[PDB]
Design a protein around this ligand. Sequence first.
Ligand SMILES: CC(C)Nc1nc2ccc(-c3ocnc3-c3ccccc3F)cc2s1
Ligand SMILES: CC(C)Nc1nc2ccc(-c3ocnc3-c3ccccc3F)cc2s1
Ligand SMILES: CC(C)Nc1nc2ccc(-c3ocnc3-c3ccccc3F)cc2s1
Ligand SMILES: CC(C)Nc1nc2ccc(-c3ocnc3-c3ccccc3F)cc2s1
Lengths: 338, 338
Amino acid sequence: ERPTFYRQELNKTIWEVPERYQNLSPVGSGAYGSVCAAFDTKTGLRVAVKKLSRPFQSIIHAKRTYRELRLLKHMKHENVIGLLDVFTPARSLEEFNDVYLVTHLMGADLNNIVKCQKLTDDHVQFLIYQILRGLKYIHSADIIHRDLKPSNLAVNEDCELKILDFGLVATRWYRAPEIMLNWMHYNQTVDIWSVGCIMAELLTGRTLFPGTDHIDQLKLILRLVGTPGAELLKKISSESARNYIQSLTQMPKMNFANVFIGANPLAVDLLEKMLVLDSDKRITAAQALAHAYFAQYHDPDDEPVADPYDQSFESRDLLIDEWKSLTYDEVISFVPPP
Amino acid sequence: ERPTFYRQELNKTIWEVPERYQNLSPVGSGAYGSVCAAFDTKTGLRVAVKKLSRPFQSIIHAKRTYRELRLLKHMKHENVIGLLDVFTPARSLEEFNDVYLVTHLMGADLNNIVKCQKLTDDHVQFLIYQILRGLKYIHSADIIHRDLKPSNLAVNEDCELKILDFGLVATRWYRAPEIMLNWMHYNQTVDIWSVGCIMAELLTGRTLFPGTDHIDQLKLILRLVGTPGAELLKKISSESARNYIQSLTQMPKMNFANVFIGANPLAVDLLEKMLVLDSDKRITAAQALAHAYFAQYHDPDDEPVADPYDQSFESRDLLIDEWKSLTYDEVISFVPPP
Ligand SMILES: CC(C)Nc1nc2ccc(-c3ocnc3-c3ccccc3F)cc2s1
Ligand SMILES: CC(C)Nc1nc2ccc(-c3ocnc3-c3ccccc3F)cc2s1
Ligand SMILES: CC(C)Nc1nc2ccc(-c3ocnc3-c3ccccc3F)cc2s1
Ligand SMILES: CC(C)Nc1nc2ccc(-c3ocnc3-c3ccccc3F)cc2s1
């Protein structure tokens, strides 16, 4: 059974992939870690093979490594990067010190797409539809990305998109304003706020809240959605935060209808239900799916939920080798899809 | 706003509850921690007030304390212990070093009920129905009890039951056999196996797998559900475990129809779908709810799911004071129900 591997250097690192993977070439200039684009002779599919960097060189890293193989092994949905393969040169636990991940190679990120570029309400309508489809899936394994953006949203020349990076020197702009209150626990709709900032950018082809820093961002945001009311300020646990906002000049809620003009009134009403200050009042992924705007794409019977996901592991405090073994067990427990 | 507290000793410990709580008397002989039965003059309801023991005396404890207040504050369902109150004598963060929890007082545990005692198929049918109703709720916030039993199942003279202790010197018998493989991640149906062992006991009024030790238990179990087949043994990651079972004398799957005779054939078919070796083949809570046996109780429109539950916190590694503050923030963030 054990494939025939072949060694080779790739970015100051010896890759020992199996012969089945050919034409390995680096990608994303460095963004998505140590990833390599290859050809899968076994499927004739263009694949992305990412090598886990110094996986077991610290507890923080072993647990982190386990954590990725755990998430990826669970992500089985049309719009989310899933594992096609997981391998290791090693033949024993002793030998084990590397983990290679395999998934479909993609066209480019929404960045390369939009950015000063404008698309069709059909393209936006689809793109956003898919983002929400994956969010709804993930969000059910009780998984929050917390930092969705265009950089981690990828599409293949066909407008099909997979949520690439996640989840449970670039800048902010798509994060939920409340992430700035360093809270400890958040509403999943933190990810909905991100969608709204991508949706709007797709439409306008312009960055919604291109904030320069923590303050610029809060200002930019409040500028459109209006300063927190009273009952809402109660929600803010920090007195510094409460006072900070109150210390600022009250701003009225602008009408998205006036900001996003020339754009679809259906998108607008949607955006209006997403870009809201009270994350507890934002629309869930699932909800936004039944929204009009995606009526020509919707389909209750084909918008699946994740299987449950046991992350009890995060609560455990093991030793480098202990985590390392768990990972090995996970690697040798992987069952490629059909 | 700050209530008027009143100090008093209770088990080598000074309880400083508010005047509104009267007639505090210890309960559960020691089981459920430092719990006290009281009278709530404000609601005229008999309440159970539990005092968190040395909450912040170690990181392991602060995080543990946060974790309980986090779970309890989320548990808002008919069949699960929920917070009625959360208080603290302290008036400042500095002062803060105690946490008091308040919930309904209950009749007794399923233990006091059954145990050598037999009830009506209507009582069992109801009792089990409720256990599954709470399980289905919890299981959706992605919460696994992992150790359900009669000790943590409580009912009030009315046959209404709340899942008391949980979740994400007594013995085993209700735990899932696979918990013995110390796995790291489990199917929620580990809790379904427990239900099956309570259901059956309700019926038979006798302990199903009264195993004396780890081996007795596995033997007792296999004795009824039959030794793992081949394809299933693959699932076992440990070679020791695989060999152990194979090393034993193959046992055929008994017919529950012959074990649970005189009992309802509907219960039996149910038990047959729960007490299964392959946790991946067991019936979900939700599934067992639409089962016949609970037809005179079922009701899709009244078998709710939990709101999402962000346990990202378990992944964080903070300092005693840091966790302590988070808890304070949680305490002062509690909003009693209606
Ligand atoms: C946009 C062009 C460069 N096409 C890309 N297609 C992909 C596809 C995935 C990845 C990736 O990003 C973060 N983790 C992974 C990954 C996860 C599991 C296995 C292998 C992986 F590479 C990056 C990219 S760049
Ligand atoms: C609950 C709702 C209304 N949501 C948010 N309420 C706030 C309130 C403040 C901030 C913030 O943004 C940038 N700096 C601050 C800040 C300023 C001073 C002290 C501490 C800070 F964090 C973000 C947010 S989001
Ligand atoms: C069976 C007789 C003795 N009736 C009981 N009724 C209850 C009700 C709850 C508890 C409890 O058990 C574990 N945690 C709690 C608890 C959780 C939050 C607040 C207060 C608490 F006491 C024990 C019992 S014993
Ligand atoms: C995956 C399925 C069929 N589920 C279970 N497969 C097993 C297999 C074994 C055991 C076990 O039970 C008590 N001792 C052992 C044991 C004996 C020797 C070494 C290690 C041990 F853990 C429990 C379980 S549950």
